Amino acid sequence: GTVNWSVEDIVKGINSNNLESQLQATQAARKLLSREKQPPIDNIIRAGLIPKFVSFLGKTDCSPIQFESAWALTNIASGTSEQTKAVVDGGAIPAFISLLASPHAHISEQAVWALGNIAGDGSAFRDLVIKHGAIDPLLALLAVPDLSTLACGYLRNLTWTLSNLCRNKNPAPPLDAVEQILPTLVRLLHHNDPEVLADSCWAISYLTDGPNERIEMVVKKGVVPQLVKLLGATELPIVTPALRAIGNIVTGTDEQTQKVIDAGALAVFPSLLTNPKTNIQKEATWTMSNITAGRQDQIQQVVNHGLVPFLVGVLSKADFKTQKEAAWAITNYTSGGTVEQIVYLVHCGIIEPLMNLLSAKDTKIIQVILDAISNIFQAAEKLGETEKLSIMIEECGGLDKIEALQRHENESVYKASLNLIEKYFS
């Protein structure tokens, strides 16, 4: 008889001095907040029930009311930032951290969920939860020989809460906290459950989004092989975070990019650059562009894996954002590549699609394309072959696009097009 209660009855029951009346009222409140039709969180907050739930969180003798209040506060902290702030202002962080060590698995799981919802609000509440000392109990909950002995849902919730503790920036998670969490996160990254894998991979992608110091921190744990293995997975929820993490890693030093390459990541890109999902193609092309901005030996490893034809294909037909990432990749290739590599580019058939891409409203893509065409023309000069390249660019209908860009609102575009016209077409 706790279904479809009024906030008035719940308030009257909780305000009584009868622990059982309070328990039934809190259960009614939980059921009201556990509905799928927009829970009445604001009504429960305006009634002043959060402090009473926070107090119930500490009644060890009555574990049912602890569980009910934890569920209710978890659902309240799942809403807007203001509702999570109301939960935190009730003093719920320390109460949930204390319940993390409860002998009842369901109560501890609800505490993990509540702390995860709180930390997911932003950097401020995340760092506050970390200051209150939640990392040590959370990791102690996972300190077991084999993770497979834990319940699937419990482990998934723990993984999600940790990933939220690794999330958000400005500021990024504390360095000590990341060092304390990484071992368990890597242990979870090798688990067999797809949801745990996806969440731990998202956490790793979070930790690798930043300065090269954090990327080095993550890479020192030896996760690049596992990340590449997950990159070749069949489930998109696992491939997406893996690709994001690989991309973040290759945005760092050339040595970290080489660590990625040595793990065999390039061998997976033939299918990533042809993935039916647009986001996968876009982020794979972005990763390829960051790889082509590396050393010449890395460009040569890209060439050896036969990925230049796939970039040509992406430039020929793909979403405009993927095509722009491919143009950036080609520009970096030509800017850092050897003459033989810049010639292999044309031998693969880049000129025609790269020229067809010049007839776009986006100005930055035009600047990138014209820089790439300047670099290729310089590579041709270096072999006394500019004339044949010019005839090629004029045959495919590009010269018309180059001379049309001589009039353009942006200045650098028309300046570069005029330079090219007067320097290689006379």
């Binding site: 556990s34 659902n75 799942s78 919802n117 999600w160 996806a198 929820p237 991309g247 901005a293």
Partner: peptide
């Protein structure tokens, strides 16, 4: 030069 970009897990979850 290395550039930056521009299925994620729920930031907050409601039990049931």
């Amino acid at each position: 030069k290395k550039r930056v970009l521009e299925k994620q897990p729920a930031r907050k979850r409601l039990n049931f």
